Design a protein around this ligand. Structure first.
Ligand code: NI
Length: 341
């Protein structure tokens, strides 16, 4: 059944709740972003109102074939009324089109649902600064102190420098980047930019990217693999067998692959700096796992919450085990006692 952490009290609303059938008493289904664990259930047969960003609505129409009459896109940073209730969509610093949602309940309660987010100090100057938030529905993906990772900027500088060095030393090397969802487009676009190439990809993935309102996108991507020396493949193909196979397909245009797997966290983070990352190599194939995250680190999450000072926190991730739930509740209490709220 629909879990309580997907329901907004005092409303008929749910958030990211499309796989439970008809949720009894739901008048408006919000979707924070286009990742499959969150949209699971949607299709052309859905006939209730879906509220979302413009970009998420482009993906619902073009990729899932949801009918236009049920897609209700909202502008960001704008007070809107939905079924009698004031709401605002905010940028979540996750993937393209991902939002946080502010609900202003008729009784005076203010609720923030983060969806999935990567907390940032820039959020402290949005419309969130303007009133008190009483309840926070929080993306707790990496809510434990072991989870450190570098800035996105540091990670992209490493990737750009590594790729440019490799291809200038060997003009017959191919660069491959893995993907299995939207998000992390800076990785492949920044490397193609430094090399003077477009990124080549499948027709399915090109269609997906053309829904994202990215500026000058027609100048950066292509379905012509032969004219490109940065290729995108399914994340599943980023291994030695998958890559050897792909190299056969390029007909001796290339004699070396340098591949990137943008993971979330990996336990080489509790020891190793970004400067010190090394690839796994077999023959003429090298694979780099780079810690490019679109979720908050522990310290980023803690700063956001200690700034916001909510009265009550409802985790939305890692909620399935008692040990995880109890650990998270202990951190929430530490933060509140340290900051004095
Ligand atoms: Ni996500």
């Amino acid at each position: 059944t629909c879990p309580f952490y997907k329901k907004i009290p005092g409303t008929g609303f749910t958030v990211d709740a499309f796989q439970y059938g008809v949720v009894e008493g739901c008048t408006a289904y919000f979707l924070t972003h286009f990742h499959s664990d969150h949209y699971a259930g949607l299709s052309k047969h859905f006939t209730f109102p879906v509220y979302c960003s413009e970009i998420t609505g482009n993906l619902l129409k073009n990729k899932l074939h949801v009918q236009e009459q049920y897609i209700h896109p909202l502008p960001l940073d704008t007070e809107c009324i939905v079924n009698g209730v004031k709401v605002v969509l905010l940028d979540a610093n996750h993937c393209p089109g991902a939002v946080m949602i502010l609900f202003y309940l008729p009784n005076g309660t203010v609720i923030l649902h983060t969806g999935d987010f990567r907390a940032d100090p820039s959020m402290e100057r949005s419309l969130l600064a303007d009133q008190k938030v009483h309840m926070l529905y929080l993306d707790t993906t990496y809510c434990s102190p072991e989870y450190t990772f570098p800035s996105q900027q540091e990670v992209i500088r490493f990737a750009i420098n590594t790729a440019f060095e490799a291809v200038t030393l060997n003009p017959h090397a191919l660069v491959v980047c893995g993907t299995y969802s939207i998000g992390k487009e800076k990785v492949f676009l920044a490397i193609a930019d430094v090399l003077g190439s477009k990124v080549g990809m499948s027709q399915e993935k090109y269609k997906t990217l053309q829904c994202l309102n990215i500026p000058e996108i027609n100048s950066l991507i292509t379905t012509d693999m032969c004219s490109s020396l940065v290729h995108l493949l399914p994340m599943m193909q980023i291994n030695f067998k998958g890559l050897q196979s792909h190299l056969k397909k390029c007909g001796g245009k290339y004699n070396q692959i340098l591949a990137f797997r943008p993971t979330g966290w990996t336990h080489s983070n509790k020891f190793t700096r970004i400067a010190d990352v090394i690839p796994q190599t077999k023959g003429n194939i090298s694979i780099y796992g780079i810690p490019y995250s679109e979720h908050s680190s522990y310290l980023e999450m803690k700063r956001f919450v200690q700034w916001l000072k909510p009265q009550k926190i409802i985790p939305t991730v890692n909620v399935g085990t008692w040990k995880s739930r109890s650990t998270m509740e202990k951190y929430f209490r530490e933060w509140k006692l340290e900051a004095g709220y």
